Amino acid sequence: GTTLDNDTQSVLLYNDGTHVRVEVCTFHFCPTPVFSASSPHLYSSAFNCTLNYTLASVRADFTEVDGSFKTIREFVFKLQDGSLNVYYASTSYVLAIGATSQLPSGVTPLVPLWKIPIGLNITNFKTLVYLRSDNTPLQAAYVVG
Amino acid sequence: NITYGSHHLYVSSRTRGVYYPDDAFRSSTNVLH
Amino acid sequence: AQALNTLVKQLSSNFGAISSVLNDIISRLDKVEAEVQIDRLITGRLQS
Amino acid sequence: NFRVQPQDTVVRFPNITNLCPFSEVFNATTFASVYAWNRKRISNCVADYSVLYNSTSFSTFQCYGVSSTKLNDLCFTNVYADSFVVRGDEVRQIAPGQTGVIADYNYKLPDDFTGCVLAWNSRNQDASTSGNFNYYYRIWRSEKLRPFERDIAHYDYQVGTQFKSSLKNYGFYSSAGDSHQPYRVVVLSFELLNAPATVCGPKQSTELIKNKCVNFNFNGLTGTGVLTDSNKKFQSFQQFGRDVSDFTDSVKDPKTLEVLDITPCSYGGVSVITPGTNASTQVAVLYQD
Amino acid sequence: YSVLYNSTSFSTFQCYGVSSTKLNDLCFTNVYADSFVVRGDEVRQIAP
Ligand SMILES: *[C@@H]1O[C@H](CO)[C@@H](O[C@@H]2O[C@H](CO)[C@@H](O[C@@H]3O[C@H](CO[C@H]4O[C@H](CO)[C@@H](O)[C@H](O[C@H]5O[C@H](CO)[C@@H](O)[C@H](O)[C@@H]5O)[C@@H]4O)[C@@H](O)[C@H](O)[C@@H]3O)[C@H](O)[C@H]2NC(C)=O)[C@H](O)[C@H]1NC(C)=O
Ligand SMILES: C=CC1=C(C)/C(=C/c2[nH]c(/C=C3N=C(/C=C4\NC(=O)C(C)=C4C=C)C(C)=C\3CCC(=O)O)c(CCC(=O)O)c2C)NC1=O
Ligand SMILES: *[C@@H]1O[C@H](CO)[C@@H](O[C@@H]2O[C@H](CO)[C@@H](O)[C@H](O)[C@H]2NC(C)=O)[C@H](O)[C@H]1NC(C)=O
Ligand SMILES: *[C@@H]1O[C@H](CO)[C@@H](O[C@@H]2O[C@H](CO)[C@@H](O)[C@H](O)[C@H]2NC(C)=O)[C@H](O)[C@H]1NC(C)=O
Ligand SMILES: *[C@@H]1O[C@H](CO)[C@@H](O[C@@H]2O[C@H](CO)[C@@H](O)[C@H](O)[C@H]2NC(C)=O)[C@H](O)[C@H]1NC(C)=O
Ligand SMILES: CCCCC/C=C/C/C=C/CCCCCCCC(=O)O
Ligand SMILES: *[C@@H]1O[C@H](CO)[C@@H](O)[C@H](O)[C@H]1NC(C)=O
Ligand SMILES: *[C@@H]1O[C@H](CO)[C@@H](O)[C@H](O)[C@H]1NC(C)=O
Ligand SMILES: *[C@@H]1O[C@H](CO)[C@@H](O)[C@H](O)[C@H]1NC(C)=O
Description:
The structure is cut from a larger assembly and holds five copies of chain A.
Chain A: E1 10-15, E2 20-25, E3 27-29, E4 43-46, E5 51-56, E6 69-80, E7 83-95, E8 111-116
Antiparallel strand pairs in A: 1-2, 2-5, 3-4, 6-7, 7-8
The complex binds a molecule of 5 linked components (NAG-NAG-BMA-MAN-MAN), biliverdine IX alpha, a molecule of 2 linked components (NAG-NAG) (3 copies), linoleic acid and 2-acetamido-2-deoxy-beta-D-glucopyranose (3 copies).
PDB class: viral protein
Keywords: spike protein, virus, viral protein
Entry title: sarbecovirus Rc-o319 S-trimer in a locked-1 conformation
């Protein structure tokens, strides 16, 4: 979105656990939008909502996995004529917990996944994560370029 | 709600973010885009 | 020297476009009808 | 060079059993306001459009990036239908490279727009004797809209020293003049011959003929060549393949999802050997290759 | 010309030698305004 509050429309693209849903609605967002216990704690309300459908049916659980980092999931988001184009590729990347933080070497091409007709001005974005039942963040990392 | 503090670094992108620029199949070629 | 100076002087040719200056075409027209004039200039300058 | 003429015709379209919702997008009970224009996703349907000849007629049918007469033989990728109500004199603003209140602040088309713009007079459906005030348009935005961008937020703006709403009400009266009468506008946007498609014209696709010079038609892309089985693996977002020149040398068949190589029919150097005219009429032909 | 958005609507607006979207970023030399009244079917005759 642009201001990420209830005077403008915002795009809500996320995985609820069984599906990938995109919602372009006017969200009264929480001060920190975050999943708590595989339950949405993202917005208080959403009224003027122009787009609401599921993009894909993938089974992503909310279970903590012990050990080191296993995979890297890379995304490219770009706006082209009012549509949000998503490019995606996932690669096996074994990175230790206390190791030096760096991106993998080589080239992994990202395939075009979706073209979402949001029809919005996008100047800012925020990341949605999930915590444990006691609202404690998990072991993860994300990169923005 | 959450007051756990933040942590940010500045790593380099070592040839990451390459995507297919079009939907055309190509093989055994070098293409400018 | 004459070949290089003739190459310099031939940039003033319109080549059938509304102007020989790219800046004039870009300033007057949007990117649907500036494109044809720019393409005419590109073809002419590549020919030169 | 030795030419081989095509003998058969191969048409391969994806198998679609449904007509496109022409009555849903052209005969809808309500149309959106132009500032809050509705976009409808169109997929897995046959774009016949000759079923509209019986009932409806259009004042504007400008098409961009494609000829109107070629629409029946094509397949369309990423089809959207944008519907709104605009005034009669603002219909011409629904075009690429236009300025005006609608094009700046309500609905902007791309400069490289591919698609068709449809419009028809919507009096006695959106106009009343006492006046219809259910349609709104933006009057000010502080920034011109980007193509296919929508702004439905409610905010005020400063006119002199007071603050007025940026949304202005359409006054649609019966017998108000054709320039001030309501018009329903449908904008169809798509891309052609570059990606897998699910919306196609009525073409009655035929069987696959291989190892012969045929006139093919794959998802609207016509041509002449020889179809052969290919050991190419398309990556499920690709429909056509290109060689080092921009030439379609392979295609994914839309019914059986296998890749077929496309090979030109004409090949091989040919030269003729003759003595002089008025010495002989016999010739010898050297078929290289 | 955006002050006319509140009150005035034009059934015909065609620009020659310049894109209409480029009018806000340009300066104009020797500007004249010719005004008259014709019939409805004679508006098409006001063109080169
Ligand atoms: C698209 O995304 C962007 C980002 O959110 C949104 O548009 C931009 O929003 C930003 C804020 O983040 C604006 O930035 C500020 O805007 C002001 C511009 O000042 C104009 O408006 C004032 C009040 O409306 C007015 O006083 C002022 O007048 C001045 O200029 C006049 C001539 O223009 C002159 O007559 C006057 O004397 C006076 O000098 C201006 O008209 C201002 O506070 C700051 O300077 C700053 O720029 C941007 O303006 C917005 N972008 C653009 C290109 O204008 C936008 O909402 C998003 N869209 C959606 C749907 O969310
Ligand atoms: C939110 C966006 C999102 C995207 C872009 C996405 C794409 C995506 N995720 C997949 C698998 C998957 N990807 C994930 C999980 C994720 N991968 C992610 O990109 C993210 C953010 C998660 C976690 C929420 C898992 C667990 C699977 C399923 C693997 C399987 O079923 O074998 C696949 C492969 C599907 C297949 O091979 O049939 C795609 C295309 N999944 C998503 O959830
Ligand atoms: C988008 O659509 C989904 C699916 O219809 C909505 O989720 C439903 O919300 C209602 C009301 O809270 C629940 O009773 C249903 O159980 C939900 N269904 C599913 C499948 O989760 C969702 O609320 C919509 N989003 C909006 C309006 O912002
Ligand atoms: C568009 O919808 C209207 C309203 O349903 C249709 O008008 C009806 O047409 C039928 C068939 O001619 C008549 O029997 C009804 O009396 C009409 N009115 C109503 C209120 O139902 C109209 O025909 C539709 N047009 C198309 C092309 O489907
Ligand atoms: C809306 O229309 C009004 C007139 O109906 C315009 O407001 C006037 O604008 C002039 C400058 O052109 C100012 O000097 C006046 O003070 C304004 N009038 C009042 C009563 O304040 C206005 O420009 C239009 N607004 C738009 C097009 O955004
Ligand atoms: C008093 C006229 C002064 C002319 C100055 C030089 C001309 C440059 C501006 C030309 C635009 C004139 C108004 C066009 C309004 C279009 C709005 C619409 O599409 O409805
Ligand atoms: C919109 O957000 C403001 C600021 O947080 C809040 O006071 C108001 O109640 C919200 N309104 C709605 C309808 O959500
Ligand atoms: C936006 O929401 C407001 C408040 O609910 C409503 O009055 C208005 O009509 C809505 N606008 C739309 C749906 O375009
Ligand atoms: C229809 O197309 C599908 C595409 O998956 C294909 O599997 C199927 O065989 C086709 N139907 C017929 C009758 O050929």
